[PDB]
């Protein structure tokens, strides 16, 4: 419960509780990091899936403002339905998936798109989850 929320739950799902069958510290550490990179990548394959480029252009234009420094960065939005669906493939519980949806819709970085809400991938990696 020390970590980012969703990463914690994904490790719990993919490594199971049997990750500590292994007594090797370094091995478990590598298991964790590889599971996380898998997740991160899938998450990337999901950026801008259900969103139109016009909507994205709009919201990114608003979030960059007048700063030249950030002008080249792209805000990687993921639709919430797609997020939940991914977390279902990965074997998270729907009890927890619902917590995740419900708690992300309370986040400042949320942006409502096409009568569904989406979020930055950075958030999905950094978010704690009680509020």
């Amino acid at each position: 419960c020390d970590e980012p929320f969703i990463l914690h739950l994904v490790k719990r799902a993919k490594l199971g509780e049997c990750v500590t069958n292994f007594t090797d510290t370094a091995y478990i550490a590598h298991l964790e990091s590889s599971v996380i990179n898998e997740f991160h990548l899938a998450l990337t394959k999901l950026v801008g899936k259900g969103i139109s480029p016009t909507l994205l252009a709009q919201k990114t234009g608003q979030l960059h403002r007048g700063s030249v420094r950030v002008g080249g960065n792209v805000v990687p939005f993921v639709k919430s339905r797609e997020l939940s669906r991914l977390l279902e493939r990965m074997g998270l519980t729907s009890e927890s998936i619902a917590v995740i949806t419900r708690g992300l819709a309370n986040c400042p970085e949320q942006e409502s798109v096409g009568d569904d809400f989406a979020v930055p991938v950075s958030l999905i990696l950094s978010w704690d989850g009680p509020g």
Binding site: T44, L56, V68, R69
Partner: protein, 103 residues
């Protein structure tokens, strides 16, 4: 002159994904994923290249795709070209992105 011709010929040739191979441990990633993560200006579609080379403005660094003559999002990866990347080196935003901000 030579480089110029080579540039024109690069821009009109499709990139060949068969040739692409993965070095140890690397992840296989499609062009689409790369584009939507790093922005389209980085792996430009011919419509985007054409725009950048034919135009003027800074405020446009093209993040998302562009419309095409058939009215669809142009997804094409042609081979990258010297002059296109120079035109990007002109924008402040891009300078910052690639770590040359000091310029």
């Amino acid at each position: 002159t030579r480089r110029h011709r080579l540039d024109e010929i690069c821009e009109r040739t499709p990139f060949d994904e068969r040739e692409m191979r993965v070095n140890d441990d690397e992840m296989r990633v499609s062009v689409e994923t790369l584009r939507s993560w790093f922005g389209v200006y980085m792996l430009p579609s011919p419509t985007v290249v054409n725009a950048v080379l034919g135009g003027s403005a800074s405020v446009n660094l093209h993040l998302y795709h562009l419309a095409d003559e058939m009215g669809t999002a142009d997804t094409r990866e042609h081979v990258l070209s010297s002059r296109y990347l120079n035109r990007l080196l002109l924008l402040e935003s891009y300078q910052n992105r690639v770590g040359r901000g000091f310029m």
